[PDB]
Design a protein around this ligand. Structure first.
Ligand SMILES: CC(=O)SCCNC(=O)CCNC(=O)[C@H](O)C(C)(C)COP(=O)(O)OP(=O)(O)OC[C@H]1O[C@@H](n2cnc3c(N)ncnc32)[C@H](O)[C@@H]1OP(=O)(O)O
Ligand SMILES: CC(=O)SCCNC(=O)CCNC(=O)[C@H](O)C(C)(C)COP(=O)(O)OP(=O)(O)OC[C@H]1O[C@@H](n2cnc3c(N)ncnc32)[C@H](O)[C@@H]1OP(=O)(O)O
Ligand SMILES: [Cl-]
Lengths: 260, 260
């Protein structure tokens, strides 16, 4: 079975992508199977479906390891985060690099939370991304909710849905672990070390498993409010951003009130 | 032992890179070893050594496979070669992709022979790349010789020195295999299939081994006119482009006169 730009576009329309949509995609590209024009056919087909005014996103992050950021002897040899040159974290697969290196793509400024975006509103989604609490309202994720966008899990494991970290941020529950770290960025065109602060997106709230995002998504799909479908050979899920965030905040806040 | 932008720069100086140099690099990056800022440190270090007027090149090619290209049923789903969008052939390693996706880089128009270039003369090296016989004088390889540039095998096996296919083009020896194939390119901004003609660069001249480039390089190094040295943990070779081509034309033409 071989996918084409044409056939991938019909698979994306079948799962629910439509004209003007903004969609953040998480992908395990190897699950799509054989593609005539390679994985670029997927991005091209998406843009065919949503049109030039739509926007595709991918979770770029960057490749600074904590083993490295923290080892002080290597401190001066670590390049600053540069949203135009820092490659995406390889843990998130080729897909965000695919977007980031496509002509016309943009990438936001908050390093660990940084998002790549292409399409009509890429300038809007990537701009004014808060350095601290980069998963809150002033981020591509918060604008995805405001713009009533969607999340596509393209063969990706369901617990890699980064949008639910934005739910973690909004949700009121006790003893949110705050994380503080120091990373090099650009200030006035020069490398500067800056202290960051965010809610922890690396580990779950104490008392839930590392993969509980997957459970939340499966509960949301159980309500019938999402859509499952095949993109190429990859089993995929399309959910509305605003609904799943409200769903996830609800879940987290109720779980929080079960404390003593 | 970990490499840095600084330490790779000193390694590149030790092997013979100098201000203003134009260097086409073939790389097996995995055996550079650990690099603090990843393989982009190598390119940054090269640019530190050669300066903004120097030029780094990598051999991009592109990804259209003969299986697909030849298959008539998928001919219409095969995207045209776009020097701005078509990713590098993956069996040349990450290095040409690394250059091609670096801001400011350029890429030439002859698909199978196409070269990515960044630096002071990148416009000149990538301009006017002949579609037929893309390894002859009107190519980045011909301009490398004219500019008296260099080739650096950065941990790469010596028989991957594509510059020697330019020597194959020049060398007068009998019964050169001519290759004819068709491939989709951009004409007037739209996809058009075009027939191509070149000397064979995928198979050696009848009567030589698939890796005879390696033997030529090793015998050139035995004249004393190349330099060996380690870039990071990778065994590397630096040769002048003009001399090795003249050396290889000599070798091929003498081998050709042993017929009859
Ligand atoms: C809680 C959080 O926030 S987690 C953060 C977000 N994480 C994510 O979004 C990740 C979602 N994906 C996953 O979790 C997947 O399981 C991941 C990526 C580990 C693994 O996915 P897999 O498909 O192995 O890998 P990936 O998605 O990179 O696809 C690889 C396909 O690349 C194509 N590809 C990669 N690079 C290129 C290229 N340069 N040119 C052409 N094709 C390429 C290939 O077909 C490659 O596979 P191959 O190695 O067989 O050739
Ligand atoms: C006849 C002809 O004309 S032949 C044509 C020319 N051919 C060439 O120039 C190829 C020369 N190289 C070779 O032959 C080598 O043996 C090749 C590439 C097969 C194999 O090289 P190897 O190092 O495996 O592979 P490569 O050079 O791609 O280095 C790989 C890695 O680089 C860095 N890497 C790759 N992608 C990224 C990325 N996205 N971000 C950061 N680093 C990356 C990594 O460390 C990745 O390795 P890992 O998988 O261990 O993490
Ligand atoms: Cl309740």
């Amino acid at each position: 079975r071989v996918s084409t730009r044409s056939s991938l576009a019909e698979d994306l329309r079948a799962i629910g992508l439509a004209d003007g949509d903004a969609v953040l995609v998480h992908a395990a590209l190897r699950k799509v199977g054989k593609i005539v024009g390679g994985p670029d056919d997927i991005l091209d087909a998406m843009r065919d479906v949503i049109g030039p005014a739509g926007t595709v996103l991918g979770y770029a992050d960057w490749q600074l390891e904590d083993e490295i950021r923290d080892d002080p002897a290597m401190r001066e040899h670590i390049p600053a985060f540069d949203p135009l040159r820092s490659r995406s974290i390889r843990d998130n697969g080729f897909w965000p690099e695919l977007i980031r290196t496509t002509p016309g793509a943009l990438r936001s400024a908050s390093p660990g939370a940084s998002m790549a975006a292409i399409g009509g509103e890429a300038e809007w989604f990537t701009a004014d991304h808060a350095l601290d609490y980069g998963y809150g309202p002033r981020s591509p994720l918060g604008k995805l909710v405001e713009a009533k966008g969607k999340v596509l899990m393209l063969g990706a494991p369901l617990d890699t849905m980064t949008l639910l970290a934005h739910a973690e941020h909004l949700a009121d529950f006790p003893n949110k672990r705050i994380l503080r770290y120091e990373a090099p960025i650009l200030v006035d065109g020069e490398k500067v070390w800056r202290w960051f602060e965010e809610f922890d997106t690396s580990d779950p709230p104490d008392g839930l498993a590392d993969d509980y995002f997957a459970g939340i998504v499966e509960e949301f799909l159980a309500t019938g409010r999402g859509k499952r479908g095949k993109i190429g050979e990859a089993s995929s899920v399309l959910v509305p951003a605003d609904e799943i965030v409200a769903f996830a905040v609800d879940w987290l806040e109720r779980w929080g009130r079960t404390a003593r």
